[PDB]
Ligand binder design. Structure first.
Ligand code: CL
Ligand code: CL
Ligand code: CL
Lengths: 207, 234, 274, 274, 234, 234, 207, 274
């Protein structure tokens, strides 16, 4: 057979989603055991076309994907680069050569480039299960942040904050915000958008 | 031995029937810092758990290339027991931390996070028997609350024998004075046992009767665990 | 053998966040809208730990502390035949904060226990001469165990509140002479003269802030804590943290702490039913 | 403070070797030609440690365990005035395996001691009321120390055998009233009701194997141990290892363990002279 | 409480006036191996300190990228006290090591030596009250003797209350039997307090009187510290 | 002092002459996992040793660039002694582990294996005097069994004085009640002393008499060690 | 003088072999102290021509020699290579560049090349007292093992297993086997050659 | 569980420096101009630690050791009802040398304590039967704590000197029967039969050197220490260090040590006032 057990339901680890042999791409949120598919997380069952997925409702960590745009926080400065925190299980590394467009020089490195406590907007240039993520500043409007508020959120919530065709992204800009894959948003006076972007976390499952 | 454990009405000292569970209460998201957390109460036994993780592990040589490492602590507060417990870990706590970790190892999808640690800390706030299972189930729930992928939740209960009667979910009087106490935990949807211990003595037929009764309790508990996790979204 | 080392920052906060935290201090308010002199919301749940002789769960903002007591009969120390005993232990549970590891109490938890113990003792709130059963022969030992379950800033003041509340909540059981304790009969509550509070004031540049949260603790220069009884005697003081403060900062801090103490003592008394 | 962590593999075995180990399981036999239900060759040498009150050296395959007892006179615990004492310690000596380091008992040695202790206690084999010299005043304390000298797989079952054999081998000395122990006069042997055995069953894919060796332990999914007295009551059970097993696996395992127990008890009795 | 602490002449048990310091003696360069060293005596309280440093720290992950790490030990010898002290660190020693380190953190210019440790070890040879301050000042002097740059020296003294009288620089009888004991240390040229503790009880007005008296003592001590350090060059 | 140690026949309490050794038994290759192993019995004193090594050492900063590091443990089982010994290492065991390591350092050709550890573990199964030497010789034999190159084997014996008579290879009665006990170990072919200690008291002439008698015993033992090692090949 | 004390004898540490000044190449199994030569091991004294050696009978470990052919076992996979166990005191490293004939690529490294638990046949391309051994897969019939049994032995016994002019190697092939320097041999149906190649360990000194 | 490991060199000295150190040994003198048989300058300051019952600060060259005693009343051990107690502790303070870290005594400090303890005990200098107050019921316990403040070479001999001097310096206080110690009245000094000395001889190639300094210890092959009473009985011997020595070296060393002992005992007696 090939059958699905649920509509748009709230899902829990171990919950049977479907029986049959579907041709689903592998996901960390679904566990296939022979002809049965189970959720591995607290989440929202989502059927699209003939395939299905589980959307996680829970989780504080970001899983690196190559070429993701990410806003990190510098923590350590090594000899030839900067260690960066991107709210992942693994910490990211921004090479000096990447920032400079050239090799470090014989007595280089104050920190006018980047010091501890600086926010950086950056893209993941390398990552797999065998190595920590590598950052690149190359693109436009990447690099250090100077001004603005940076709001932290569940990376799990990032797709709701942007929304269908960036609809949620629109209805925030015009109210008074860059949304990274990282669960962090870089952002008028007395802009208390934060109080609303926390309310999206607390109601994403609703309507 | 000392007190009567099965009364002339055929009921237990706390009024329960042999096949009846103590009342259960579950709270989730109880701690702000923890990536996930839970309080589990089964009767007067109460545990809190906190989870932190996937995160890189500093002693790299203690990490594993293909898996996350689970780091687990079962601890009882000094005021959780009838007589004060010394806060230094006991041999009992050391054993139970291992048995609880190995139960969780079967459930947590650790190969998703190579070279990381997932930290699981549990504390017994009140001990009235069954605290290893209440700890394990709080940990399971706390891991779900943390969004850490697992094959299934873990539900467990202790069965045993008291004045010759096979009984479900022991209280402290029964654990202390009864003839046998057998904690069992499972991933119920997968038909898999994650924790299994017996202390005391049973015949092989009594053991099979008890195992069967445990499964009935586990299935009830599992549904309560599922509902607790869903409750905030519905 | 042992030694104290400078720690790593376990909450490195970005330059940009510091500016926000202190942005409304000019107007006398913080992040959460509270005044510079306000505590966060406080709840105190008595008898939370049911097998404790007394207990209290304190929530102060996102800080959570569970204190519990257990009483035992002991021979008194030879130098104090006419007094019972109080033993204070604090643990900063690895549940409480991400960088906490399990192990025995580190220097921070040891400091907490010792500051609380002194404040209780020197306040004269718990008169240990009241804990004697048979002079020279049998006295009560009060074990006070204080567990920080959620580290959200200003854990000292929450530990003091929880400790005082647990002690107030402590049941005393009948003693049977043959000597045994009969736990079926509560004959008393632990006898206290009054509550005590500890008030922590953090220095953040030119401002003093009462009841620092996690973020404020992450940016403060130093902190100082002052313990009070209801007569507003000072019954303990502890400067903590890496930074220094002026004589004038300390003077101002004490004046500010004492003003807050009056209100905190009042709220604690409501919570205790006294 | 303490915590349990997933270990590194201390015996990473190559894919190719796994296939060989299990290659004859279809025919009901293993590497060494033994049946899936057979123990390895067992020798038990009593009185091996000459200054022990009783002792036994157990060789089970390449596993070697030395157990020894020493008896002392103690006041009984206040809650047990009519019983002596049994204290079980197991050490996994750094002699025993390459990755073992010296230190106090790790969680594996602590688990072993506690599983053996329970099986001895709950079996009722050693009735501690028999260890009383003067009720309320003087009793025997039996220190049982169990040293794993060569870690060759299934150390639990060898530890149980050695423990039971050492206890059976224990000399009891004359007590002289003035109270003293006179070691020139053996008046008794420690009184046991019967022997006990522990039987460990490892799950290796679709097979269950009794008495796993080092290689089999390195590839097994999980293991479960069942303790028996001669009436074939079950007197302890412990699932160990990272993997899960089904209810049906456990049922089958118990049935298989119990069949083996009959034979093992018989062989142990020959070794003991009972 | 037991002995009279203020006598009918208005003097103290050791003959001092309420505003009088015990006698002070300072020796520097007392140890050959230590990079710097000092003995400080205040009355019958005597400490020795040794300093080693800036040096690279082996557990690199315990080092700091922008600062040196101070590593500090306050320890009392078994024979320093009236009754023998067990040599294992006590909870008191653990607390005092931290309070002393944090005092030194304000003075030592640690950002000059990234990724290094500066080790500061002190031993109480004789304890007759005030040993945390005598330790701290020996450490300060030993750091100067070692040539490790600091903002200022640290001077300190304990004030308190005895039979209702505010008194400067307590002895052991006063520390034990008095109503309050308040150790204060400062960087006096910078007007900055580095250590501040009170045990016992004082009214807010008594506290201000005592703080004021402490400053007067500190200033005297500071000058003796300056002169001691200069003495070998002049 | 209490018992007579030299009887009217001029013999010792166990029937031996002053210049006679206890009987010796040596077994090699006793353990399967150990790279090398040995049991050595001298009278009723019995030790087992196990060796593991050359292997790379994980705390690289604890390794040596030009040499292997020897890691050595002398431990007594709780049931090896007349009264139960607590299994926690004692100060005696700590001292003896060092003295035994330093003896082995002279023999093992450690510079063959830079940056490695060679682990040497010994356990006293029965203690009736001389257990440090029996341990050391079991370790020497176990190292040979492991194929780890050495300059020479180590043989040793304790000489002493009992009721004024110089005696070879003490038993426990003599060690406890005698006037002196002097363990000596050597690399006999190289004429080199690797371990040398005396407890008790001797005149300088008695010391020289005793040293001379020890050499005679050592030479006998050495030949037994050589023969034991050859025995399986011949 | 220049004299030898023994014929073909079993030898033990500290045993005097010879007196004089021979022109012997240095060996770990012989210790020269001025004009005397001693065995350092349990072994077999072997005189060849005018020189002599000690053949060790004991020892579980292999000492790397450059250009030795060796069959190791992969244990760890680092970013840019594989850690390998060759039964030595030091663990060996097989560089990725060596295996690939090219540099690692930006998201490379599953393990289809080599994972933990794989046996590898390989040659030692670099080794001295200052560094761990480096492996090369370059040659023919090196690289991963797919099939066959791999039998572990005392590296000390390797020269007996091959034998004089590979005589022992012949009398095994025809009975029903590659013999590495490593004390490991890669190898019809129900071939219980192992039971015989253990018997060579137990009788090498004999006849 | 514990184990002894080869240490790293904590004083790697350059080839060139070794040649200089030994350059004048042919002429019978060292770096500092002292003869191969001479101790460095010795000062002994009694009653240095004023709250100790007895104490001595020993400076031997750049080595500095502070020993102190404290006496307590105890019930005697059951096996020794007619003797008091001596407990020796040595600590190598992290103040003393750059590579010393704080922690409990390592194997070097444990060895020092045990060598000193044996030499004191086996010398019969301190007759513990003299420490009895009431036979079977009350005896003196002598706690001897020996702190190495500056590690300058030959710390053993300085520890022995300091230990003997502190014991000689020990005040005995009046015991009041009700039993209490009255510290206002000194009735005695600890009773010693005689002093003891320990003499350390280092082997540096073909030379033997008495009282090795830090540099000499850094280049020596091995060292051996011999303890003497004034009758020149040998009352303890300890070879220490990684290297071996010949029977002849040891013989020569003892002869050389004993010659030095006579002079050292004489100087120590002057320092003690006996
Ligand atoms: Cl439980
Ligand atoms: Cl102080
Ligand atoms: Cl010995």
């Amino acid at each position: 057979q090939e059958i699905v057990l649920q509509p748009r339901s709230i899902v829990v680890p171990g919950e049977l989603l479907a029986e049959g042999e579907f041709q689903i791409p592998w996901s960390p949120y679904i566990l296939k055991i022979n002809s049965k598919y189970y959720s591995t997380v607290v989440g929202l069952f989502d059927v699209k076309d003939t395939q299905f997925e589980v959307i996680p409702l829970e989780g504080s960590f970001y899983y690196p994907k190559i070429n993701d745009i990410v806003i990190g926080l510098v923590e350590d400065v090594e000899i030839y680069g900067w260690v960066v925190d991107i709210k992942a299980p693994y910490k990211a590394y921004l090479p000096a050569s990447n920032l400079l467009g050239r090799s470090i020089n014989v007595g280089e490195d104050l920190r006018r480039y980047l010091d501890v406590g600086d926010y950086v907007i950056a893209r993941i240039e390398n990552f797999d299960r065998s190595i920590d993520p590598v950052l690149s500043v190359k693109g436009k409007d990447l690099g250090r942040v100077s001004n603005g508020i940076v709001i932290d959120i569940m990376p799990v919530k990032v797709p709701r904050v942007i929304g269908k065709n960036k609809s949620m992204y629109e209805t925030l800009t015009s109210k008074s915000i860059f949304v990274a894959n990282n669960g962090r948003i870089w952002a008028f006076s007395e802009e208390i958008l934060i109080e609303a972007i926390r309310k999206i976390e607390n109601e994403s499952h609703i309507k | 031995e000392r007190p009567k454990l099965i009364l002339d009405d055929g009921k237990r000292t706390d009024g329960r029937k042999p096949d009846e569970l103590r009342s259960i209460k579950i709270e989730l998201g109880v701690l702000k810092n923890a990536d996930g957390s839970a309080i589990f109460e089964m009767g007067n036994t109460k545990a809190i758990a906190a989870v932190y993780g996937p995160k890189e592990m500093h002693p790299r040589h203690l990490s594993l290339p293909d898996r996350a490492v689970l780091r687990v602590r079962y601890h009882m507060t000094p005021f959780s027991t009838d007589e004060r417990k010394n806060p230094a870990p006991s041999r009992r706590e050391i054993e139970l931390s291992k048995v609880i970790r190995e139960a969780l190892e079967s459930a947590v999808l650790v190969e998703l996070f190579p070279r990381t640690a997932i930290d699981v800390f549990t504390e017994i706030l009140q001990a009235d028997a069954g605290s290893r299972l209440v700890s394990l189930m709080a940990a399971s729930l706390a891991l779900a609350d943390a969004g850490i992928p697992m094959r299934d939740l873990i539900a467990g209960v202790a069965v045993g024998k008291a004045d010759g009667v096979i009984i479900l979910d022991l209280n402290e009087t029964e654990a202390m004075w009864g003839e046998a106490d057998m904690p069992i935990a499972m991933m119920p949807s997968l038909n898999q046992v994650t924790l299994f211990q017996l202390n005391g003595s049973m015949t092989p037929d009594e053991f099979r009767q008890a195992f069967d009764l445990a499964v009935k309790g586990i299935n009830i508990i599992y549904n309560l665990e599922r509902e607790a996790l869903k409750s905030k979204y519905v | 053998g042992h030694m104290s080392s400078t720690p790593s920052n376990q909450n490195i906060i970005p330059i940009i966040k510091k500016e926000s935290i202190v942005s409304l201090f000019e107007k006398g308010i913080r992040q959460d809208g509270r005044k510079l002199t306000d505590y966060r919301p406080l709840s105190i749940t008595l008898d939370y730990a049911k097998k404790a002789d007394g207990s209290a769960l304190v929530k102060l903002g996102t800080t959570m502390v569970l204190a519990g007591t257990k009483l035992e009969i002991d021979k008194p120390y030879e130098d104090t035949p006419n007094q019972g005993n109080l033993i204070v232990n604090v643990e900063l549970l690895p549940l409480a904060y991400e960088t906490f590891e399990p192990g025995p109490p580190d220097e921070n938890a040891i400091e907490l226990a010792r500051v609380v113990d002194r404040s209780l003792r020197d306040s004269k709130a718990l008169d240990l001469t009241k804990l004697v059963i048979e002079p020279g022969k049998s006295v009560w030992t009060v074990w006070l165990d204080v567990y920080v379950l959620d580290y959200g800033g200003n854990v000292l003041d929450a530990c003091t509140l929880a400790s005082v509340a647990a002690l107030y909540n402590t049941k005393v059981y009948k003693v049977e002479q043959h000597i045994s304790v009969n736990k079926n009969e509560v004959v008393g509550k632990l006898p206290l003269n009054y509550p005590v509070v500890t008030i922590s004031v953090a220095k953040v540049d030119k401002y003093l802030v009462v009841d620092p949260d996690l973020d404020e603790e992450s940016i403060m220069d130093a902190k100082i804590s002052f313990s009070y009884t209801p007569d507003l005697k000072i019954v303990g003081i502890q400067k903590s943290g890496k930074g220094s403060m002026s004589l004038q900062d300390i003077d101002q801090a004490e004046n500010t702490a004492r003003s807050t103490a009056v209100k905190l003592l009042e709220e604690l008394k409501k919570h205790l039913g006294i």
